[PDB]
Amino acid sequence: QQQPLPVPPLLESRRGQPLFMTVQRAHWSFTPGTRASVWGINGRYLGPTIRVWKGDDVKLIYSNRLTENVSMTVAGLQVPGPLMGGPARMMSPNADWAPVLPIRQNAATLWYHANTPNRTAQQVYNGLAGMWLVEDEVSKSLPIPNHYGVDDFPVIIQDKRLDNFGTPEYNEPGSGGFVGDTLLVNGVQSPYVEVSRGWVRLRLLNASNSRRYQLQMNDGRPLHVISGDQGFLPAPVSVKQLSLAPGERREILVDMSNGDEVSITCILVSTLVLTLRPTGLLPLVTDSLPMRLLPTEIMAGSPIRSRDISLGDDPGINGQLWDVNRIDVTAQQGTWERWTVRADEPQAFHIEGVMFQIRNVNGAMPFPEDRGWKDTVWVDGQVELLVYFGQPSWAHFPFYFNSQTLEMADRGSIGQLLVNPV
Length: 422
What we know:
This protein is an all-beta fold. Helices cover about 0% and strands about 40% of the residues. It has 3 domains: about 1-135, Immunoglobulin-like; about 135-300, Sandwich (Immunoglobulin-like); about 300-420, Cupredoxins -  blue copper proteins (Immunoglobulin-like), CATH 2.60.40.420. It has helices at about 120-125, 405-410; strands spanning about 10, 20-25, 40, 50-55, 55-65, 70-75, 95, 100, 110-115, 130-135, 150-160, 180-185, 190, 190-195, 200-205, 215, 225-230, 230-240, 240-245, 250-255, 260-265, 270-280, 305-310, 330, 335-350, 355-360, 375-390, 400-405, 415-420. The strands form 5 sheets. Strands 13-12-11-15-20-17-18 form a 7-stranded mixed β-sheet, with no helix packed on it. Strands 23, 24, 25, 26, 27, 28 and 29 form a 7-stranded mixed β-sheet that branches. The termini are far apart. One of its GO terms (biological process) is response to ionizing radiation. It is found in: Periplasm.
């Protein structure tokens, strides 16, 4: 018998109001009749879902109760380098960091996690990560499910290697990323989520070290995408299969009106991700898909500078290993650039303090789907990104563009980007 999907408690800004993020130990059940000591925030595996609002000036208070140095960051966050994390704001055991973040981006599904140098893969794999939501006018305005824990759920997909007793074991692969055999959603294996008979909103997130999944409904039904690493798409995208690379995030809408049970599927022991089961009565005659999400498909402008980012088979970017004292890219705040990212060996690529649009994929066109605002992209050969640098950074508090395959970032596959104001 499968277990219910665990829903991390909601910790929004605008109602308490310092947001107390305590990194600490554990005790989680990755399996029935088992218990392992893991890592997370506020006594949970992973963390609580954070909710902030555009225009907010949030006070985050990070406290390190772990047994080692820790540096936290929010993937996809739009703020100056001095407010990102990671190495520049490292926290030693019992140390705390209380920044004041000014939210100024459109609604989106982000995520936070540890990015400690040489130690990111093991820290994230320990359960040190969570969801981060940015709400605005548009979002809570659309006729879409927005009742967190009720019709709006966070689907944090994870890849684990749990021993027989239920403890996640991480034996350093090295040559490549880490690959597990047990699918985990929100900490539990192939859970089921009891939803009502109507539209269901799922916020998918790949918090895997390197594994990339291709999801689909076990019943063949299409699947409505509305986001969106960095926000809603101009309009819903109905697809049969969905690609989700590590660090990638996507919001899909599911219609559970027919009443019959549906599951999401992707060596692994089980290909079952999550099961949705209607729980009771009807609406009625509740909502067909909106026709258009983004009020305005306000898109890309002209680039004034082009770059060539190369990765490959070994750690490093353009044949160089991460250097805290080296600035690899110097952009101008408020400009547009065209980055050509290439990779012999497939992997995810991420860029901090920026947002971009995939313009080309191997000389071909990107999917529906991948035509919105993003900060993470899957590379297997070469992709062309239209980048916009709306935030500033400092030489000693720069932004990072990295290989999203944790074992490789932790190994030198990191570059430092300096954005000049303004």
